[PDB]
């Protein structure tokens, strides 16, 4: 693919395929030419070296270093490592309708609530706004709804308030050691850029407000909303999965 700079950027698999093709075609040539056997042999060694580099580089001894000196990433390397495709792209992924910010106290909140910044929530529930806007006939179509949100018009805030009502949001903190590292809350729209967390759940998250941050995730489907409200809600996860002692308690 072309970078913005006019330059191109490519996978190392291309360098490894080109190695294999060059040496293979040169072998075809040296066979057509009836070359002496010592040279044919060298080319067959080099061909096996190139295929072995292409499949799994580094296993057959000294891995083929490309441009920096770093060994070329081969096929097996894209599957194998923790970084491969299993651990990185398949057993976990980056996610839509996700946000984050610094956390701060919300002592005024009830146990089932969390302060969610206005601008953050505007963005996370964009399709839900577009939807109500067209059912009220305030928006003629989706691109006009987008432009009404871009202008952040006063009626849009009122619609956004209506969508967030009774809609649970997942808060997550790294590291997620046990299941209470994810909890659902009913969000409360707040002016300001910081997420407000209920004190009593700070224990489960191991949350202290000296700058920790939290991920926000929006359960989209009716099923996901119900699993968040029934199974993952803060109020409903009072006891720990390990001991029978409660985790939610004043401090």
């Amino acid at each position: 693919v072309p970078l913005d700079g006019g330059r191109f950027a490519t996978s190392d698999l291309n360098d490894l395929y080109r190695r294999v093709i060059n040496r293979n075609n040169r072998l075809k040539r040296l066979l057509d030419l009836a070359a002496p056997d010592i040279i044919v042999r060298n080319e067959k060694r080099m061909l096996q070296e190139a295929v072995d580099a292409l499949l799994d580089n580094g296993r057959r001894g000294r891995a083929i270093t490309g441009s920096n000196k770093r060994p070329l990433k081969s096929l097996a390397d894209m599957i194998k490592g923790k970084q491969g495709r299993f651990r990185q792209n398949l057993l976990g992924k980056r996610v839509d309708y996700s946000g984050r910010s610094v956390i701060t106290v919300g002592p005024y909140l009830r146990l089932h609530q969390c302060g969610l910044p206005k601008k953050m929530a505007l963005e996370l529930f964009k399709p839900f706004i577009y939807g109500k806007l067209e059912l009220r006939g305030l928006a003629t179509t989706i691109k006009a709804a987008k432009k009404m949100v871009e202008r952040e018009e006063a009626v849009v805030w009122d619609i956004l308030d209506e969508v967030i009502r009774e809609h649970p949001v997942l808060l997550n903190r790294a590291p997620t050691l046990h299941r209470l590292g994810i909890q659902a809350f009913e969000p409360v729209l707040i002016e300001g850029k910081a997420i407000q967390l209920h004190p009593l759940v700070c224990a489960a998250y191991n949350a202290d407000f000296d700058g920790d941050q939290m991920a926000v995730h929006v359960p989209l489907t009716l099923e996901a909303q119900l699993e968040a409200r029934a199974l993952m809600m803060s109020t409903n996860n009072i006891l720990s999965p390990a001991n029978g002692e409660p985790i939610i308690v004043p401090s």
Binding site: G6, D15, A35, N42, Q83, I142, K143
Partner: protein, 277 residues
């Protein structure tokens, strides 16, 4: 524990016979006449020469083995077109062939995006010029300074120096640690976001509804021209192929369809709202 392809091959080359002048002449006369063994022995004996040149040709494109193999191709053409009748020695003639084939392969295979020899040769001259400029100008050559020296176009000099720019690995992690590769930064541009794709779905669906809201002969002459409902995007003159068969009446009816639809966008709440877009 001799496992290395290189050391194995160089062991085998050392294990060869070295040729003299009169031996080269005997073998070369038999070789050109079409001796099997003569060809093999002249090649095998002169493998050492390729390696020597291949050794002073590394860190430029391919690996030592790669260069060696390519060089060996030059040795074969050298034995094929050697003249034993001329008193001048083989080593001198072969050196040309070996260097030629190595250089030619190094100009092609080395670059991921295959650069043509013509541009490569031009580039050589630009670079050599830059070197002489740099030694006398303590600073480095400008594109314009190089262009002045060769009496060539600044645009042509810049195009060439651009082609010199070599390729960045996408798989390579950049954040110093293996934190993120370039692939993870660089987004799929040909693929639209679901937001953008959904907007086009809304417009495509609205069109069908918009076509079944105006005149029946106004949506039958506006749609099939732009290729909205029809199969092919025709022009004012080409709408005659269907049933219209007119040039003036097609153009009056096309614009009559758009004028009633401009009022439909003014009333719904777009017009100047969706003019910026």
């Amino acid at each position: 524990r001799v496992l290395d392809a290189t050391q194995l091959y160089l062991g085998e080359i050392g294990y060869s016979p070295l040729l003299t002048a009169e031996e080269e002449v005997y073998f070369a006369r038999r070789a050109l006449r079409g001796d099997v063994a003569s060809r093999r022995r002249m090649i095998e004996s002169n493998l050492r020469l390729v390696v020597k040149i291949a050794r002073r040709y590394g860190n430029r494109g391919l690996a030592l083995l790669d260069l060696i193999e390519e060089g060996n191709l030059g040795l074969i053409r050298a034995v094929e077109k050697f003249d034993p009748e001329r008193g001048f020695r083989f080593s001198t003639y072969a050196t040309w062939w070996i260097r030629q084939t190595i250089e030619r392969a190094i100009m092609n295979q080395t670059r991921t995006i295959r650069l043509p020899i013509h541009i490569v040769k031009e580039l050589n001259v630009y670079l050599r010029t830059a070197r002489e400029l740099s030694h006398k100008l303590d600073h480095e050559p400008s594109a314009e300074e190089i262009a002045e020296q060769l009496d060539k176009p600044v645009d042509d000099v810049s195009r060439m120096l651009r082609l010199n720019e070599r390729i960045t690995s996408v798989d390579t992690p950049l954040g110093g640690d293996s934190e993120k590769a370039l692939l993870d930064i660089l987004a799929d541009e040909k693929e639209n976001g679901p937001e953008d794709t959904t907007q086009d779905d809304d417009m495509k669906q609205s069109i069908v509804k918009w076509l079944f809201e105006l005149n029946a002969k106004q949506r039958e002459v506006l749609a099939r021209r732009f290729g909205l409902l029809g199969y092919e995007a025709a022009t004012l003159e080409d709408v005659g192929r269907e049933i219209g068969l007119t040039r003036e009446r097609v153009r009056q009816i096309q614009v009559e369809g758009l004028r009633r639809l401009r009022e439909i966008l003014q009333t719904q709440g777009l017009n100047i709202e969706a003019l910026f877009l």
